[PDB]
From a paper:
Meprins (Meprin α and β) are multidomain, Zn-dependent proteases. They belong to the astacin family and metzincin superfamily of endo-proteinases. Originally discovered in the early 1980s in human intestine and mouse kidney, Meprins have only been described in vertebrate tissue such as human skin, leukocytes and various cancer cells. They are involved in a broad range of proteolytic processes, among these connective tissue homeostasis and immunological and intestinal barrier function. Meprin β shows a striking preference for negatively charged amino acids proximal to the scissile bond.
To investigate this interaction in detail, we crystallized the catalytically active ectodomain of human Meprin β in complex with the tertiary-amine inhibitor MWT-S-270. The mature Meprin β variant Meprin β62–595 (MβΔC) crystallized in the presence of MWT-S-270 in two different space groups, the already reported hexagonal space group P6122 (178) (data not shown) and, additionally, under the conditions reported here, in the monoclinic space group C2 (5), with two monomers in the asymmetric unit. Each monomer spans the catalytic active protease domain (Asn62-Leu259), the MAM-domain (Ser260-Cys427) and the TRAF-domain (Pro428-Gln595). Both monomers are covalently linked through an intermolecular disulfide bridge connecting residue Cys305 of monomer A and B. This feature could not be observed in the crystal structure described previously. Each monomer comprises at least three bound metal ions: two tentative calcium ions and a catalytic zinc ion. The hydroxamic acid moiety is bound to the zinc ion in a bidentate fashion, which is commonly observed with these inhibitors. One benzyl residue is directed to the S1-site, while the second benzyl residue of the tertiary amine is directed towards the S1′-subsite, shaped by Arg238. The unexpected interaction is a fixation of the benzoic acid moiety within the S1′-site via a network of hydrogen bonds, i.e., the sidechain OH of Ser212 at a distance of 2.8–2.9 Å, the backbone NH of Ser212 at a distance of 3.2 Å and a water-bridged hydrogen bond with Thr214 at a distance of 2.6 and 2.8 Å. The closest distance between the carboxylic acid and the guanidinium moiety of Arg184 is around 4 Å, albeit the electron density for the C11, C12 and C13 of MWT-S-270 in monomer A and C8, C9 and C13 in monomer B is not defined, and the moiety of the inhibitor is probably highly flexible via rotation around the single bond connecting C7-C8. Moreover, the whole loop forming the lower rim of the active site cleft, harboring Arg184, is also less well resolved, as reflected by higher B-factors, especially in monomer B. The missing electron density of the side chain of Arg184 in monomer B and the barely resolved Arg184 in monomer A (together with the less well resolved whole loop) led us to conclude a high degree of flexibility.
Residue numbers in the entry:
A (entry chain B), B (entry chain A): 62 to 594
The structure:
Amino acid sequence: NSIIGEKYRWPHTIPYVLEDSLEMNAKGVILNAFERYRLKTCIDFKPWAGETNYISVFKGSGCWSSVGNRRVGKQELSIGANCDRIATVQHEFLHALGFWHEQSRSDRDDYVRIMWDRILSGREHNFNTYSDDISDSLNVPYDYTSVMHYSKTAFQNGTEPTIVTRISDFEDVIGQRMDFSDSDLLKLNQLYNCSSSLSFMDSCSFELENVCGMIQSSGDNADWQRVSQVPRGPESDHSNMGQCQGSGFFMHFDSSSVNVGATAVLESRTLYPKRGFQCLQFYLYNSGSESDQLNIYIREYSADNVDGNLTLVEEIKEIPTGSWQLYHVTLKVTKKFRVVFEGRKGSGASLGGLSIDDINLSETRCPHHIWHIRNFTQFIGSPNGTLYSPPFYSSKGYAFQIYLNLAHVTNAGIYFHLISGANDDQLQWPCPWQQATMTLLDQNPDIRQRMSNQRSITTDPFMTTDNGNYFWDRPSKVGTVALFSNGTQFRRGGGYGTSAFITHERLKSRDFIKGDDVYILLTVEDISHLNST
Amino acid sequence: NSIIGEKYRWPHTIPYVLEDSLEMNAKGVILNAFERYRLKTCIDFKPWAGETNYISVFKGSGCWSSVGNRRVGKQELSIGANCDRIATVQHEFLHALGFWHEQSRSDRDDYVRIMWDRILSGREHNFNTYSDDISDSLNVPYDYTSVMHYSKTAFQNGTEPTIVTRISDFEDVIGQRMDFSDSDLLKLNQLYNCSSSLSFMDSCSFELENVCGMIQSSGDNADWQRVSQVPRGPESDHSNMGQCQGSGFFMHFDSSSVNVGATAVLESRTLYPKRGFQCLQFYLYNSGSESDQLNIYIREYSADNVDGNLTLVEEIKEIPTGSWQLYHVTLKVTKKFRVVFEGRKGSGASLGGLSIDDINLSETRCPHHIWHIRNFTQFIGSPNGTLYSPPFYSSKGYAFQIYLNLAHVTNAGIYFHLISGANDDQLQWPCPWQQATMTLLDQNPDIRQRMSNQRSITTDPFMTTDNGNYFWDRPSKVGTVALFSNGTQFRRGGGYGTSAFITHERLKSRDFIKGDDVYILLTVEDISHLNST
Ligand SMILES: *[C@@H]1O[C@H](CO)[C@@H](O[C@@H]2O[C@H](CO)[C@@H](O[C@@H]3O[C@H](CO[C@H]4O[C@H](CO[C@H]5O[C@H](CO)[C@@H](O)[C@H](O)[C@@H]5O[C@H]5O[C@H](CO)[C@@H](O)[C@H](O)[C@@H]5O)[C@@H](O)[C@H](O[C@H]5O[C@H](CO)[C@@H](O)[C@H](O)[C@@H]5O)[C@@H]4O)[C@@H](O)[C@H](O[C@H]4O[C@H](CO)[C@@H](O)[C@H](O)[C@@H]4O[C@H]4O[C@H](CO)[C@@H](O)[C@H](O)[C@@H]4O)[C@@H]3O)[C@H](O)[C@H]2NC(C)=O)[C@H](O)[C@H]1NC(C)=O
Ligand SMILES: *[C@@H]1O[C@H](CO)[C@@H](O[C@@H]2O[C@H](CO)[C@@H](O[C@@H]3O[C@H](CO[C@H]4O[C@H](CO[C@H]5O[C@H](CO)[C@@H](O)[C@H](O)[C@@H]5O[C@H]5O[C@H](CO)[C@@H](O)[C@H](O)[C@@H]5O)[C@@H](O)[C@H](O[C@H]5O[C@H](CO)[C@@H](O)[C@H](O)[C@@H]5O)[C@@H]4O)[C@@H](O)[C@H](O[C@H]4O[C@H](CO)[C@@H](O)[C@H](O)[C@@H]4O)[C@@H]3O)[C@H](O)[C@H]2NC(C)=O)[C@H](O)[C@H]1NC(C)=O
Ligand SMILES: *[C@@H]1O[C@H](CO)[C@@H](O[C@@H]2O[C@H](CO)[C@@H](O)[C@H](O)[C@H]2NC(C)=O)[C@H](O)[C@H]1NC(C)=O
Ligand SMILES: *[C@@H]1O[C@H](CO)[C@@H](O[C@@H]2O[C@H](CO)[C@@H](O)[C@H](O)[C@H]2NC(C)=O)[C@H](O)[C@H]1NC(C)=O
Ligand SMILES: O=C(CN(Cc1cccc(C(=O)O)c1)Cc1cccc(C(=O)O)c1)NO
Ligand SMILES: O=C(CN(Cc1cccc(C(=O)O)c1)Cc1cccc(C(=O)O)c1)NO
Ligand SMILES: *[C@@H]1O[C@H](CO)[C@@H](O)[C@H](O)[C@H]1NC(C)=O
Ligand SMILES: *[C@@H]1O[C@H](CO)[C@@H](O)[C@H](O)[C@H]1NC(C)=O
Ligand SMILES: *[C@@H]1O[C@H](CO)[C@@H](O)[C@H](O)[C@H]1NC(C)=O
Ligand SMILES: *[C@@H]1O[C@H](CO)[C@@H](O)[C@H](O)[C@H]1NC(C)=O
Ligand SMILES: *[C@@H]1O[C@H](CO)[C@@H](O)[C@H](O)[C@H]1NC(C)=O
Ligand SMILES: [Ca+2]
Ligand SMILES: [Ca+2]
Ligand SMILES: [Ca+2]
Ligand SMILES: [Ca+2]
Ligand SMILES: [Cl-]
Ligand SMILES: [Cl-]
Ligand SMILES: [Zn+2]
Ligand SMILES: [Zn+2]
């Protein structure tokens, strides 16, 4: 579904302009989409600085883009109303990069049947097919899960689908708008001879005996052990969760059989950063004591320190026992370096130890907060599936809470709530231009194969409610009464998001649910600086 | 371990000359090595035709090459005596393409320990390291399995190893000379922006519900079913063989519940050939009748029949029941086409069906013959581990037999025997310049991830034995008496190969043994046309 012709290729770095017609939330979402390209492709984006051909993103009618580099100078790409979704931006830029819709493939009739009699009159022009002399599928099979594939209802007249998948099980699969599919990357990365990405650094699941090049320190008291189980926990690794026999390993620091203060250090291979900011993430399991801790250091190398200088970046203490726990550690390294995992036994009694698995490192921004939902499957489609996150404080001081609604039969909804907080007396009301990004984590061991489902909203301080109040005003003024889990009363403002965050079927696909656990990643950022672009 | 500098890159297609000093067997092995590059990389090779810089392969002392395009015009690469091994040629050309040995990495001391007290005087320079200002490891961890990594005995004085891997399990792993490692390809394909290969077409294991783009035909009597088990067999697929719970699927044609002559047709996606010759391979399981057959067709597309005209290429009949069977089908397609699998029920009664799994298609030469060894593990290191293949006939008419000796404690040996045959009266004796290629198949589901162990020998008609006879003379004249399994007597000539075909440890690694089955692939080709190159 790629356009044939070297004249349609962009440079690997695309110049762009974010026109002022774009909504605030749209501008932030667009910049997020660029981050995804930087993680999984060799395509990059930079502000236009006089280049002849560039992309002008503006709030036109609908979401659309030309296919390929048209070399017309200013090439328009429309992110109109309701197009402010990261998957939609990725989709539109795949058009710009030279891709038609998946159902436009020359072989599309072998996999889907277009119901022309059920298309709305005047809408049949979007269901075209391109022959193999102008369209090249790059030796990749037809991809129902493509982010460039319409859903079954596209431009439908009535309740009857316009696109019918011959493999009936794919009827509701087509139309996913979560992230690149594996084939989307295969085709794009092939079309642009992509050898590496900007933001990806390392992914380690310990499934090979060389443990991703990590080295055991000799100036310590114990070694991390590559094991597939620990008696007291965990019974299996996090990557496979015991699915495959003889597979599924993790590194374990046995704190039960060492003295207080003893340490085991595991250091990563040498890494060369390109951006100056990184996010280190990994899953931890604690079957020992709450006094045991994991310390993260950064060993930076320079001409001044050829041996490398250590810097403590985070101490992870009081680790919950009995379940895998996701952690994020923010880094700001600019020189070649290693990551250091030091497991230290505390004074408390331990009968197990610390386990680490599914490590990923990328030159990306960490999420500000994480919502970890245990025993999640019971709530899908259940009346008691009305879930509220713990209270969090945004970077600017606003207290907020997340509402995830799984009670309805087909769709899951997610909403961002402001709640009463300790800084409300000194905060700006109504909440102005705070972009809340909510991401349902696709818990694939490899960050490169994650199709996380992400939606963003921006608080508009002029939005009002039916009774005349400002929607994002101080929760004590406009919010309803709510009770914390501990019984403490608080005020919860209006919730804003979408009732169509993710379908229950997609929620049960891939690795959104893993170990009956779900993780929702949260970032609340002031984007008022995007008003002028 | 890659050399830094854009001037050290070759063109993707390297011009080469095979000097007349090269041994006959070496010339054939080199051309075989090129086929591996064409299968797994974007590197190609063409005979030198006046290009300024080209590679001149000649029979120097030992096996060596410069690192990278040195832009000195004629750049020599030595394949001397005993260097005529496909993995050694691949290794030497990885040098030419710009790679140092893996243990020369700047971080090599974190993974291996050099026992300097054990190096031969004057050979310690061979263990030097290149810093990261001239060497780039391309963000790939240290690779013990690299084809560019010395074995533990390199330049050793005595019986004690010079290179000790700090992860002890890799002590005997380093030094593998079977094929590219996965990391070797990751680095090379990254260094030359390889987006695709010349010879790879498709790999299908049916592990995704879209079944690699294969189509179910409507003009037949039944459908192939994507299943993970069949009551009468097989109990699991061939890819995973029940290793992973809920995973491992194959396509099944149920002959038990259809009439005589009924067919189920599965057609592949559209394919575009580049070379004019292809090899289709796949694994079959038969739990039905001995009269059931699998027919392979090719649907070629042309201006004459836009719908496509079918051509029968092979009829697979009398399929042994109760075990997975590997098949190879030779193709000669030059226009865009599909592969067509037609399962046909015979007249016999059936309680099962035909199963197909782990299909691979590449623009490569099929092996002429295959030796399938059942219940293989019992013979490893056993006194009764002296195995003889069935008799085969080479393309020129010579009858031959393969001898695999597993009785030695550490090494497996393989030998090529000429045997008495029905054309011996009219054959040229002594056997002149017939190259026998013996390949222990690494039965990975994906052909692209196979590290098959291959050795080749060429019959020298002047080679003599101690008693004055020609080694490769007519077996009736110079051979010993032997009995086929059915009791029929024949004459077996001398066996030539190596007692160090593969170590037992490597033999038990990866997928050489799969389902307790081993496949040895055989090609005997006249290479007398290579005397003048
Ligand atoms: C115990 O087990 C033992 C081991 O299995 C077993 O021994 C085997 O017994 C069987 C049965 O008796 C023997 O089978 C015979 O094999 C012969 C050899 O076949 C191979 O070689 C053929 C000839 O190749 C030459 O010609 C080709 C082109 O024609 C060239 O491409 C070659 O380069 C080669 O040229 C060279 O040789 C020429 C001299 O012949 C010379 O002029 C020329 O210049 C050059 O030097 C190939 O055609 C043949 O390929 C076919 O068969 C194989 C099967 O293995 C397939 O895989 C191939 O795809 C292809 O189909 C082999 O490579 C055969 O000639 C002989 O065939 C004849 O008979 C059968 C059965 O009736 C017919 O199907 C066939 O058409 C032939 O019929 C012709 O001849 C007969 C008279 O001979 C005649 O009646 C008929 O009308 C017609 O004229 C037969 O298959 C086998 O050889 C034995 N193996 C060994 C190792 O010895 C033993 O019996 C068992 N014991 C018991 C008790 O059961
Ligand atoms: C039942 O459950 C409920 C639900 O949890 C419980 O309710 C909680 O109870 C606890 C304890 O009583 C409360 O803790 C208190 O929290 C407040 C707020 O913390 C957050 O904000 C801090 C201030 O942020 C402002 O300032 C920073 C710079 O200082 C700035 O960067 C920010 O952007 C923000 O700026 C804005 O606000 C300013 C006014 O404050 C303006 O001037 C400015 O212009 C801006 O408008 C912040 O410091 C803090 O960050 C730290 O802590 C978090 C979490 O611990 C951590 O993640 C960070 O890394 C930091 O380490 C938070 O973001 C806090 O101010 C209180 O601390 C003060 O008081 C104590 C006691 O004297 C001192 O020790 C401190 O030093 C400090 O002086 C206190 O921690 C919590 O707020 C409350 N939650 C809710 C939702 O109600 C309830 O208690 C439970 N009931 C029972 C019975 O158990
Ligand atoms: C990906 O790499 C290929 C191979 O180098 C590039 O193809 C070349 O493009 C130039 C510019 O038009 C042509 O003159 C050459 O003939 C092409 N070579 C081949 C073998 O086709 C291609 O341009 C690269 N893609 C991008 C997006 O840069
Ligand atoms: C692989 O592609 C890269 C582009 O990403 C090529 O690197 C460029 O090479 C040209 C010419 O040598 C230089 O002018 C550029 O500065 C390079 N750009 C970058 C980003 O490195 C490289 O030449 C290609 N390699 C091969 C073997 O074709
Ligand atoms: O693919 C697109 C959007 N698509 C139409 C569409 C709209 C809603 C749902 C679906 C679906 O998949 O269910 C598809 C085509 C298009 C082309 C030009 C203009 C507009 C417009 O928005 O007016 C829309 N954009 O690139
Ligand atoms: O790398 C190699 C092989 N050679 C380097 C070499 C080349 C030419 C001459 C000599 C020499 O001094 O005679 C040595 C090192 C080697 C040889 C044998 C076994 C192993 C091993 O891996 O054990 C390593 N060529 O590119
Ligand atoms: C949609 O279908 C209805 C029912 O056939 C018809 O009345 C109407 O005109 C159609 N509208 C369009 C835009 O196709
Ligand atoms: C929620 O409801 C589901 C379905 O009715 C039930 O299985 C589950 O136990 C309930 N959860 C809690 C925490 O009560
Ligand atoms: C090898 O070691 C032996 C044992 O000490 C020594 O006598 C000999 O000189 C050494 N040879 C070389 C070439 O290092
Ligand atoms: C060969 O010997 C091994 C062990 O010595 C034994 O397990 C196997 O069954 C034997 N195979 C035979 C006798 O065919
Ligand atoms: C030697 O090689 C040339 C070149 O291919 C070939 O034509 C010739 O026949 C070969 N010699 C013999 C005896 O086959
Ligand atoms: Ca793991
Ligand atoms: Ca240690
Ligand atoms: Ca399979
Ligand atoms: Ca059918
Ligand atoms: Cl992530
Ligand atoms: Cl193969
Ligand atoms: Zn589109
Ligand atoms: Zn070498």
